[PDB]
Amino acid sequence: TPDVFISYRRNSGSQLASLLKVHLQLHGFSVFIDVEKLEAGKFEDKLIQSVMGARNFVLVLSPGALDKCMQDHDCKDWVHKEIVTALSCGKNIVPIIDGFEWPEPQVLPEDMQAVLTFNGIKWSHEYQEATIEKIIRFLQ
Numbered sequence: 001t002p003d004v005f006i007s008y009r010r011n012s013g014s015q016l017a018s019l020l021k022v023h024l025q026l027h028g029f030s031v032f033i034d035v036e037k038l039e040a041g042k043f044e045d046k047l048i049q050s051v052m053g054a055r056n057f058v059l060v061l062s063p064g065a066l067d068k069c070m071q072d073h074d075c076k077d078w079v080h081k082e083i084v085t086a087l088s089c090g091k092n093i094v095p096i097i098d099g100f101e102w103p104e105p106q107v108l109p110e111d112m113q114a115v116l117t118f119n120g121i122k123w124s125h126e127y128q129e130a131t132i133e134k135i136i137r138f139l140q
């Protein structure tokens with residue numbers, strides 16, 4: 001199954017998520033993005049399975065991308081769910097920062113606050129090849 005799971009906010013990070021997918025595939029990685037690889041069945045089970053199956057968890061932090069995670073203590077938000085799974089499973093989490101403002105940890109549910117402790121990569125529109133090279137160095 002895929003080596004890289006891409007988690008993104010549909011309403012703001014869809015273009016960067018798709019750009020990451022193309023580049024990572026060109027460099028030889030098997031990539032999961034929902035619009036390509038989520039197929040038939042109950043998507044709750046399929047999505048959690050796909051996170052568990054991938055060593056690497058690439059989190060697209062577009063502007064406001066964790067907003068809907070805030071006060072989502074019932075864990076109904078799908079980026080929240082994906083992040084908790086990646087954290088629980090001890091995945092290699094690689095945040096990609098694209099205009100994202102770092103929130104204070106206490107605005108996030110406790111089960112995902114650890115996501116802010118991972119070294120992130122700043123997406124550079126002027127130096128995209130270099131950004132991709134760094135992402136590939138971070139992947140396992």
Ligand SMILES: O=P(O)(O)OP(=O)(O)OC[C@H]1OC[C@@H](F)[C@@H]1O
Pocket residue numbers: 006007008009010011033034047077078079082
């Ligand atoms: O399901 P929604 O609300 O349409 O989608 P979101 O933009 O809120 O989050 C989608 C992310 O969750 C799982 C992962 F595949 C996808 O990148």
